[PDB]
Amino acid sequence: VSLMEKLKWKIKCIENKFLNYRLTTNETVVAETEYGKVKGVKRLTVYDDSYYSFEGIPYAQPPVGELRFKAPQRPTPWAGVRDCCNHKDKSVQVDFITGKVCGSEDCLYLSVYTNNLNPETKRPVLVYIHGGGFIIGENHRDMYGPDYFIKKDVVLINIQYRLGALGFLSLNSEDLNVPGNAGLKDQVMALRWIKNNCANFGGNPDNITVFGESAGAASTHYMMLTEQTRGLFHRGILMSGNAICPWANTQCQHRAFTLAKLAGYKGEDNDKDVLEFLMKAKPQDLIKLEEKVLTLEERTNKVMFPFGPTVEPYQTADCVLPKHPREMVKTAWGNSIPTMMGNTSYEGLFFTSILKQMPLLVKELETCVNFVPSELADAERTAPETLEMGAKIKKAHVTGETPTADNFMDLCSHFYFWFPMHRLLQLRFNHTSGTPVYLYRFDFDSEDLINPYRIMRSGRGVKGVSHTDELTYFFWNQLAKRMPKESREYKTIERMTGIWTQFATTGNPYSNEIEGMENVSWDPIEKSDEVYKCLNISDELKMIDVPEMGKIKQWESMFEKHRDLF
Numbered sequence: 252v253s254l255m256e257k258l259k260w261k262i263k264c265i266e267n268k269f270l271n272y273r274l275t276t277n278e279t280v281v282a283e284t285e286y287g288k289v290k291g292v293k294r295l296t297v298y299d300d301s302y303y304s305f306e307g308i309p310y311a312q313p314p315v316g317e318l319r320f321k322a323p324q325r326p327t328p329w330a331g332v333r334d335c336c337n338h339k340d341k342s343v344q345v346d347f348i349t350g351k352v353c354g355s356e357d358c359l360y361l362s363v364y365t366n367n368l369n370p371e372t373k374r375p376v377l378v379y380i381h382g383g384g385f386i387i388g389e390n391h392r393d394m395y396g397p398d399y400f401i402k403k404d405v406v407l408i409n410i411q412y413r414l415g416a417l418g419f420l421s422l423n424s425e426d427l428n429v430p431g432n433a434g435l436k437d438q439v440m441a442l443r444w445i446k447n448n449c450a451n452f453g454g455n456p457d458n459i460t461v462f463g464e465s466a467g468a469a470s471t472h473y474m475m476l477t478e479q480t481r482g483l484f485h486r487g488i489l490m491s492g493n494a495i496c497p498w499a500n501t502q503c504q505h506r507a508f509t510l511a512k513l514a515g516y517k518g519e520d521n522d523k524d525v526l527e528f529l530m531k532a533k534p535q536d537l538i539k540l541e542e543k544v545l546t547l548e549e550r551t552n553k554v555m556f557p558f559g560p561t562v563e564p565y566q567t568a569d570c571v572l573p574k575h576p577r578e579m580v581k582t583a584w585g586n587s588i589p590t591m592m593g594n595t596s597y598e599g600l601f602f603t604s605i606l607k608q609m610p611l612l613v614k615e616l617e618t619c620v621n622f623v624p625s626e627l628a629d630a631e632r633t634a635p636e637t638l639e640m641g642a643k644i645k646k647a648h649v650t651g652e653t654p655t656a657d658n659f660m661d662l663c664s665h666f667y668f669w670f671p672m673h674r675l676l677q678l679r680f681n682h683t684s685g686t687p688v689y690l691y692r693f694d695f696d697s698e699d700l701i702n703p704y705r706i707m708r709s710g711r712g713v714k715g716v717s718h719t720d721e722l723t724y725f726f727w728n729q730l731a732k733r734m735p736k737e738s739r740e741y742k743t744i745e746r747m748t749g750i751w752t753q754f755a756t757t758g759n760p761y762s763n764e765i766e767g768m769e770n771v772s773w774d775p776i777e778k779s780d781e782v783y784k785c786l787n788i789s790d791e792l793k794m795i796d797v798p799e800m801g802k803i804k805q806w807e808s809m810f811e812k813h814r815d816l817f
């Protein structure tokens with residue numbers, strides 16, 4: 252990231268700290284939890300609203316020392332009152348702006364926000380799980396401020412969970428108790444805390460909605476898939492992701508040795524010896540070297556992250572993913588709660604910055620063989636069958652005789668988001684009680700209000716609605732500002748928080764009380780539908796057939812001779 256954007260960011264960080272101070276009030280409050288009393292504080296917003304804030308509520312023991320890489324442990328209760336008037340640190344990660352490692356192993360906290368601690372009615376509880384490819388992210392209000400949602404009468408909860416190798420190391424040897432998915436197990440424990448404590452904050456424990464974007468959507472989907480969470484919540488929203496996205500899981504059991512060897516491990520590839528070395532390493536050393544773990548071959552085959560959610564090699568008490576996600580869909584309790592899913596109208600624009608530094612990626616579209624789903628592709632991607640499958644992809648996205656950068660990013664929209672969504676819907680339809688699933692398409696484009704991901708994707712002055720552009724209209728961030736009440740951005744904020752709050756409340760995202768939705772008839776998807784309908788969210792709200800449908804069917808056609816793997 253440029254020095255200009257670095258200094259720009261440092262300043263906004265300095266501005267955030269002062270604005271945070273200025274929007275703090277002297278009205279502190281104490282709430283009960285099952286682990287003890289917590290002290291919160293009332294905060295203000297730039298729109299002259301206010302909310303009660305509890306940050307730094309632990310839901311697990313700090314996963315340090317002998318607990319590194321292990322499933323989370325219930326936290327120790329306290330006598331007296333715990334200070335929750337400040338946030339804790341984020342999980343150890345590379346700061347995308349600075350390039351330096353930041354955060355802490357001591358990161359298993361959540362934050363609780365509401366405009367009223369003693370509401371007349373038990374309120375809907377909305378639980379946000381952040382994305383960041385399971386390797387970055389936080390619940391800090393500089394990125395995920397509740398300032399917009401607290402205009403609504405709900406309780407909003409933002410969780411953290413372990414990232415990177417510290418969250419997702421996985422070792423085959425059963426004796427070592429490192430099966431993988433520690434970070435997902437973190438989420439499970441936070442959800443359990445939420446179920447048992449939201450009532451203390453005005454929440455209705457019988458009306459909880461879990462939602463997340465990108466890896467947070469994959470996370471939400473995992474929480475709907477695993478038996479560990481059966482009946483814990485009542486609606487789910489998957490924003491630009493789910494568990495069967497190719498980036499959402501990986502078999503990484505062999506990569507722990509590689510990481511160790513990157514960090515100076517001397518010895519043999521043995522799970523016990525590799526673990527012992529990894530247990531003593533500085534956590535910042537491991538996280539910084541994570542970028543080097545994937546092989547050239549793995550990158551070529553579109554493995555995006557070395558460590559992430561995995562199929563656990565053996566079962567344990569807290570096991571979250573005993574089988575591949577496709578399999579877990581067959582029996583998933585979450586198939587039977589109201590569900591909303593969606594994507595932006597140009598997801599793949601997110602990969603602009605990556606394409607810039609690696610222009611040759613565009614030549615992958617010559618045959619598109621590298622984008623053929625890995626389960627269908629041969630190892631070298633040289634089989635004539637793989638060339639045939641790649642030709643189907645090529646026909647779907649290459650518009651001229653030579654592929655362009657926009658063809659690449661259009662392709663990415665489907666490989667990473669739209670096609671996995673299609674597969675999920677079709678799979679789920681064969682295993683559901685009949686609860687509704689609604690689709691949205693976020694198609695609102697502005698650069699008058701942005702979020703820091705625009706900086707990371709190098710999308711300043713860039714047109715189209717990228718992966719993460721919707722976050723701007725759900726959460727306050729330190730790059731935001733007060734918008735005029737009549738502006739299209741402000742209207743979109745009210746629309747997005749409105750629909751999300753309507754869906755969380757009733758399991759149905761339609762309400763006549765939301766501006767622009769007067770002529771909207773938002774029906775869910777049925778198994779018999781050959782064409783998906785979605786609410787296209789733009790300056791106007793309009794129900795349309797998913798424009799991406801034709802391309803989606805073209806991807807599906809690669810599976811013509813392998814229907815059992817679709």
Ligand SMILES: *B(O)c1ccc(C)c(OCc2ccccc2)c1
Pocket residue numbers: 347382383384385386387464465466467498555
């Ligand atoms: B969603 O959580 C997500 C989807 C796809 C990608 C590539 C992704 O990467 C985020 C990231 C990239 C580079 C460095 C740090 C984070 C996230």
